[PDB]
Amino acid sequence: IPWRACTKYLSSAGILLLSLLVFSQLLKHMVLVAIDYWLAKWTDSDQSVYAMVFTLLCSLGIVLCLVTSVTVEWTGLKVAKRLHRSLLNRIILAPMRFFETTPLGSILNRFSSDCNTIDQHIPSTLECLSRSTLLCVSALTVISYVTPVFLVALLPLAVVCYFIQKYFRVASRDLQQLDDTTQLPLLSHFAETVEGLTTIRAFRYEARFQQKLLEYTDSNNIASLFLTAANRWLEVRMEYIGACVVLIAAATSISNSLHRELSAGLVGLGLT
Amino acid sequence: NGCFVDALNVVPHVFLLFITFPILFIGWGSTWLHFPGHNLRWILTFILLFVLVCEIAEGILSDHLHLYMPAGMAFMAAITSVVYYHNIETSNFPKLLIALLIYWTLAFITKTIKFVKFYDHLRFCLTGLLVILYGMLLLVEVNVIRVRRYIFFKTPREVKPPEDLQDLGVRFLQPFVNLLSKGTYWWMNAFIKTAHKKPIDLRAIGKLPIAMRALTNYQRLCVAFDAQARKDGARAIWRALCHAFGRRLILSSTFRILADLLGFAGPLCIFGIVDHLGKNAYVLAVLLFLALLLQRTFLQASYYVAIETGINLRGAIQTKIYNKIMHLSTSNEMTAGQICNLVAIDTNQLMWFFFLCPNLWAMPVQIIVGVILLYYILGVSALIGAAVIILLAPVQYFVATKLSQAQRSTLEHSNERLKQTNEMLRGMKLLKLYAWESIFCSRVEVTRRKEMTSLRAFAVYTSISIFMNTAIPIAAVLITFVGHVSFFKESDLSPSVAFASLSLFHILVTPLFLLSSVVRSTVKALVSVQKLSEFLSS
Amino acid sequence: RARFVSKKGNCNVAHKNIREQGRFLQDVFTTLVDLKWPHTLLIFTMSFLCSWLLFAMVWWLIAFAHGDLAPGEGTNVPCVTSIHSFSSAFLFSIEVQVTIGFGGRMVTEECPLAILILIVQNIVGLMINAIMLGCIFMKTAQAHRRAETLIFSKHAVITLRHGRLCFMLRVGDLRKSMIISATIHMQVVRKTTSPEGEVVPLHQVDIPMENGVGGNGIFLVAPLIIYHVIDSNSPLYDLAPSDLHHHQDLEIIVILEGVVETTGITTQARTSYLADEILWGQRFVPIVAEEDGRYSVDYSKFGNTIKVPTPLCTARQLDEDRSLL
Amino acid sequence: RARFVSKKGNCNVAHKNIREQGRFLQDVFTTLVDLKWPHTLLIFTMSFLCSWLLFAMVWWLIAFAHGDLAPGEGTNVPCVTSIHSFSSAFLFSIEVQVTIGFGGRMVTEECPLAILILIVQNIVGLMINAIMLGCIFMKTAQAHRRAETLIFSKHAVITLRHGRLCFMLRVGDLRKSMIISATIHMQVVRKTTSPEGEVVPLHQVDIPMENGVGGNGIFLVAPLIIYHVIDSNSPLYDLAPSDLHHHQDLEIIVILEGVVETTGITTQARTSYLADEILWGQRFVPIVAEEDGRYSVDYSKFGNTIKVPTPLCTARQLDEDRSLL
Ligand SMILES: COc1ccc(Cl)cc1C(=O)NCCc1ccc(S(=O)(=O)NC(=O)NC2CCCCC2)cc1
Ligand SMILES: Nc1ncnc2c1ncn2[C@@H]1O[C@H](COP(=O)(O)OP(=O)(O)OP(O)(O)=S)[C@@H](O)[C@H]1O
Numbered sequence A: 001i002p003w004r005a006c007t008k009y010l011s012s013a014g015i016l017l018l019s020l021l022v023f024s025q026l027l028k029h030m031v032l033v034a035i036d037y038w039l040a041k042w043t044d045s046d047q048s049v050y051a052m053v054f055t056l057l058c059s060l061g062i063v064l065c066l067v068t069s070v071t072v073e074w075t076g077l078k079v080a081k082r083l084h085r086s087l088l089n090r091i092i093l094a095p096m097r098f099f100e101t102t103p104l105g106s107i108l109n110r111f112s113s114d115c116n117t118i119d120q121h122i123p124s125t126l127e128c129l130s131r132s133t134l135l136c137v138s139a140l141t142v143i144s145y146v147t148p149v150f151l152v153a154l155l156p157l158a159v160v161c162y163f164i165q166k167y168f169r170v171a172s173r174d175l176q177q178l179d180d181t182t183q184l185p186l187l188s189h190f191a192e193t194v195e196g197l198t199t200i201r202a203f204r205y206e207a208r209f210q211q212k213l214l215e216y217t218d219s220n221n222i223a224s225l226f227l228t229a230a231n232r233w234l235e236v237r238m239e240y241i242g243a244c245v246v247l248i249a250a251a252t253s254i255s256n257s258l259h260r261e262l263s264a265g266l267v268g269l270g271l272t
Numbered sequence B: 001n002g003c004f005v006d007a008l009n010v011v012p013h014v015f016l017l018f019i020t021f022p023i024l025f026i027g028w029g030s031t032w033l034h035f036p037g038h039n040l041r042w043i044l045t046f047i048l049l050f051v052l053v054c055e056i057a058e059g060i061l062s063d064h065l066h067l068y069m070p071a072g073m074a075f076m077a078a079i080t081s082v083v084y085y086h087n088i089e090t091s092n093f094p095k096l097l098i099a100l101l102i103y104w105t106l107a108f109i110t111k112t113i114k115f116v117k118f119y120d121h122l123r124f125c126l127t128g129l130l131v132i133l134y135g136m137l138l139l140v141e142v143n144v145i146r147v148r149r150y151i152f153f154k155t156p157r158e159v160k161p162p163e164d165l166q167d168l169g170v171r172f173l174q175p176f177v178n179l180l181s182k183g184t185y186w187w188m189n190a191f192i193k194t195a196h197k198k199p200i201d202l203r204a205i206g207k208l209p210i211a212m213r214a215l216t217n218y219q220r221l222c223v224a225f226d227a228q229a230r231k232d233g234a235r236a237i238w239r240a241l242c243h244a245f246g247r248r249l250i251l252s253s254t255f256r257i258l259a260d261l262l263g264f265a266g267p268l269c270i271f272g273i274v275d276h277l278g279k280n281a282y283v284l285a286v287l288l289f290l291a292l293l294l295q296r297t298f299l300q301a302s303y304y305v306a307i308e309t310g311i312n313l314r315g316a317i318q319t320k321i322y323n324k325i326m327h328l329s330t331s332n333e334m335t336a337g338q339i340c341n342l343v344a345i346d347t348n349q350l351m352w353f354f355f356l357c358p359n360l361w362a363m364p365v366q367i368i369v370g371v372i373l374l375y376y377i378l379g380v381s382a383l384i385g386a387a388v389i390i391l392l393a394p395v396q397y398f399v400a401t402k403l404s405q406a407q408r409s410t411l412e413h414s415n416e417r418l419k420q421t422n423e424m425l426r427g428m429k430l431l432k433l434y435a436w437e438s439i440f441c442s443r444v445e446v447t448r449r450k451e452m453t454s455l456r457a458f459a460v461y462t463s464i465s466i467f468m469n470t471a472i473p474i475a476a477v478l479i480t481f482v483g484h485v486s487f488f489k490e491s492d493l494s495p496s497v498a499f500a501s502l503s504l505f506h507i508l509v510t511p512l513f514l515l516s517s518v519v520r521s522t523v524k525a526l527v528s529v530q531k532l533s534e535f536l537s538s
Numbered sequence C, D: 001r002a003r004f005v006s007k008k009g010n011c012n013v014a015h016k017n018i019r020e021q022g023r024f025l026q027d028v029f030t031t032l033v034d035l036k037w038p039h040t041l042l043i044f045t046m047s048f049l050c051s052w053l054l055f056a057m058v059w060w061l062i063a064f065a066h067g068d069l070a071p072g073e074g075t076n077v078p079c080v081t082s083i084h085s086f087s088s089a090f091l092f093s094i095e096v097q098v099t100i101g102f103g104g105r106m107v108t109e110e111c112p113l114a115i116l117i118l119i120v121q122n123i124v125g126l127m128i129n130a131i132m133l134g135c136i137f138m139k140t141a142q143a144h145r146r147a148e149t150l151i152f153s154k155h156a157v158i159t160l161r162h163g164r165l166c167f168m169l170r171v172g173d174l175r176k177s178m179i180i181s182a183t184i185h186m187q188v189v190r191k192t193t194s195p196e197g198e199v200v201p202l203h204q205v206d207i208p209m210e211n212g213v214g215g216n217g218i219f220l221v222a223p224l225i226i227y228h229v230i231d232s233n234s235p236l237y238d239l240a241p242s243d244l245h246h247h248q249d250l251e252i253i254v255i256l257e258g259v260v261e262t263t264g265i266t267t268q269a270r271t272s273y274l275a276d277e278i279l280w281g282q283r284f285v286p287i288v289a290e291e292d293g294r295y296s297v298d299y300s301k302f303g304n305t306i307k308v309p310t311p312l313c314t315a316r317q318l319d320e321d322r323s324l325l
């Protein structure tokens, strides 16, 4: 999916809240790293002034977090409102032959789900994605600032992740939809057996229908199983790389930051 | 003659690494045959890998090349033994196995000589562990020749490679791969690479093994239900499921607890490294690497085994309640909707609860180890901090409940809106023939405002959840560090203490959220199984 | 669509579910004599280096163990004179193994254990040298390359010869060296359903090559068009000329066998013609021409083709018309 | 009961009362190139050690006899410099024989007898090296292992094709490497009594393999069921379908010959089917399947078989019914 759908989604919010969200997130993550950066200097030993500065940073963090959360909430609600109203208005002014041409399922279905789905899950998932990506960038910057040379070692591995990204999505999407399909005729089948139960017990066709249901539940399980297998694959490989990076970081920190740099407040942040 | 015995140990690794290369190069230039002790062999080989890392650590501490070469040679020898065993699993032979057995015997002899010469006078423990591992691998090889045909009488009476997972086109081969790939999912490389190019479909997908079908799980479940009902209910069906799904679930749970232990262990070696440099650290770094990879691998294997047990259970109880649908009476509209909800929400609740079952056993040990570990690093002050984080777990649950309530209300409004739409999108020509459409759009917008009003409270609760999520990590460190140094004992807080506390705070925040969802899922699953029992027994 | 055997002569059908009982490696040297040159050279150098390093290690150890390795003047004579370190020991191993025999370091008559290690070193060296020569020579009788030099025309045409439908295909040689007693096995494959309800996915049937009184084989000097006549008895006789170009799935393969002169091995070549490759009603251009005092063959017109006004109809219907005319 | 040739392809009939005139050893190297690998390696090391010890003894003796063996300073130069005991003499023998040439002990120009012993030592060494390489190479052209990789289905079925009784058996290849010009010789054996009162204990008769216009040979890429049609002229045509399973003693063997590509040798494979192995009225399952862009062959169904409703009767009675229908 291109950046155009998200661009329209966020431009429906307006310029008023876009920056209010983005800069607030950036500042919250900067505070969350700076508190530990100052704790690093706190460690080695004006302890009272140090602790007071730590308290100030701790307060800034929570205030900024509350602000960001309220921003995401308000923006998501406004976007849902405007999108629903615009959809209704644009559907109102359509010609009759358009309504006769398009089936009712598609026109009704967007309002039935798309609207519901967005309201239920887009704000929370967007917030989680933003927090995750900014926390990852912050952690990379931390382990770079701690050990400079470690930076130059981490850009190779990250490029590896790029290749792990593509091959994942182009399958993870696919399997996903397959699951949905194997869920749809199964349930429906159940209902068909319940209503015409007398006819089916009369024809003595119970065996063939049980065969059909075993077939359907197998087709459901193979999909819901390959999906979890692929998720495990991506998980394990990304984790192996996430362990390679900490190995290399610690191996560079023990030598560079002790033998030559002789600075102890560094290795703490990097390892953590 | 220490160097003499070191060389005598170096020799057999060299012998094996030299015989492996012709065969490995011929093999490098679709029936899987498994042998008894395969999984034991791979487990022991990983233990050998670990002990060899320790030997390399000893050799670094001592340094004299010839004194630490034996470890570097046994490393390649064990990797080449793995390569041999892969080449034998792919194509069976009676001779390659003897080729392994010779090397095992000679390595055992050399290790015995080392042990004797040491007894006559850290090294002791490592050498002993290697001796025990090589001996157990020798016994495995003796078992393998005892089984089929190392030399034994004429014909192997060989198995006839398993057709369950290897006969006619199947694509999901989980039970039929090398016990390393059973952990690291290496068999998915081919699938995912082919999937990148050609779009996947049911013709491009496999078929489920005989180990997991509707028939297999239904058979096991009905056998357990039979053995329990012949001794005659909700508790009955529960115990039946328990005894029917048995070993897999507890295996997943113990994988999970061992992973939790190693995860609690990581930050302590971090602490040790931080201490050492401020005042024996490369060893701790490589140990941290090994422990991270092993902990996460075990965690993932645990997840997968639990998920597969859950999928089995879903298939089983689904085909069972369909078998019950055949014998029910006609006197029992509302029952049809209740039946199809009994398959669409109740069964999914059951299966997701079976997903989260091992987490419910592994959470308490995790929080207990966390609190006891942080107490011994920060002292009494730690306890105070250990309260705050824990206090987030019940509160979270409360928040969740509120969400649910809100959800219900919202859903109601939503449903009504849909009704007021279904008319407009059907009387289209009627509607536009006199342009009464705006009059109905006003009513539709009137419903929408009520829907919007509900959503505000829901998103407020979501905001409170996200806020607490990152507020409690900050508050723990705040009220702990300020309450430790400038409050209680003015103890000098070395960087190690603070950073280990930070690590443990994150490693404890991650599991805490899951306990709330686990409790909700468990109570909902209990209610759904009561419902399933009430239905299945009418 | 899927092809049976590729144009280059390699086989297309990929095998699945082979119950490997190990015979794939049990053919130890008839396996690796199949390999390419880089792999075979790699595994030969690895054989040699493996053996050399093995015995260099054992010699290092024996000189260490006798104590001759401990540098000392008098009260001893080393089992191998002038040995100091591992490097010189590996130099001794390669000096005695590959039979250069430098003689700067002398093995002496004081230690019979060194005599034993030498008397096994040399025999194993000689045996592995013997096999690593025989197998490379058994390789240099790879004459499949001579199966490469043969060529067939890209597409085959059918014509009307002697009042009967005929199919013509070209072959030819690309070197001076002849191929002895080459024979043609010409086969057709098709998914067939028997009158008994039996369906076969693929059905090889021999179509004869039509030479003098009989005979399966031919003589290759110049490009010779192979000449078969399809008759009512022939299996190909039923098809239609308009249904072959697009829809039908008919592979006609030819297998030419023959033993090359100088090596004496028996090579062959295999090629397929699909239903979309073959065409109808044409004639090749005459290649051979009476030049100055010889016969010149021009391979530019090898694949050239001219139009011929011949009737277009099905061989069954053509046989019915022959019954009518 | 007794089998003619075993399934593995080895011959069963044990020979008795062979008037050995010695040709069994007169084939000196074509005897031992048949042997296994351990025996041949044993006899090669024994050849080499035998020759080495022989010449080491003669050299020890010649150095003893010249008196150069008697340790003395001056008034002489040893025929072989620096020789002391038997051990160093055997070291000299292996130093000059296998052409390492260490040169610590020097043969000198004072004694022409040592020149003679060297000039015969080296030539005999070279001759025995030449034969012990040629014969091991002549061995590594053992391609019977390639006769191992071929496979036939365990039991053979008969069917009704084209209104006539037919027998179907499977074959197949197990590697990429082809087999050139494979031919089928299909034979039946039976204790037969002639109308002249002559009884034979075993009577081989050819049953034809039915291909296109003629031909004895086939082309092996994928598993090809071999297709013969028994007719009134065929020797197998007289039997009954209920008498074959238990009582009668009829071995039907097939011999497939062909030359492998890379070595060029001509190998073959032999298998038997007994009266209790063969069965009646069935059909094999189609192996080849159109996969993604190729032909996939599944060897799991290789030996699989399905029931077919075909009439069960004797081929003689079936021919009489064909005369009636
Ligand atoms: C969020 O992680 C965790 C972190 C820590 C702990 Cl102590 C437990 C869990 C956890 O989750 N508890 C195990 C149970 C579980 C459920 C879902 C997932 S999953 O990864 O989200 N999903 C899949 O794998 N496959 C899905 C399954 C449903 C059908 C469609 C495919 C993974 C595992
Ligand atoms: N029992 C036997 N085993 C192997 N070879 C034999 C045997 N008997 C004879 N031969 C050889 O094969 C040929 C068979 O001819 P025979 O049956 O021996 O008749 P023959 O006239 O008696 O010839 P002889 O025995 O040499 S005087 C002879 O030329 C023998 O050289």
Ligand SMILES: Nc1ncnc2c1ncn2[C@@H]1O[C@H](COP(=O)(O)OP(=O)(O)OP(O)(O)=S)[C@@H](O)[C@H]1O
Pocket: C017, C018, C019, C020, D151, D152, D153, D154, D155, D299, D300, D302, D303, D304
């Ligand atoms: N999938 C396979 N791939 C390669 N070779 C096979 C395969 N299956 C069998 N063979 C061998 O080729 C012959 C074919 O006979 P089969 O189809 O296996 O009948 P069979 O009675 O089951 O014999 P078996 O499997 O050895 S008990 C057997 O003798 C096997 O040795």
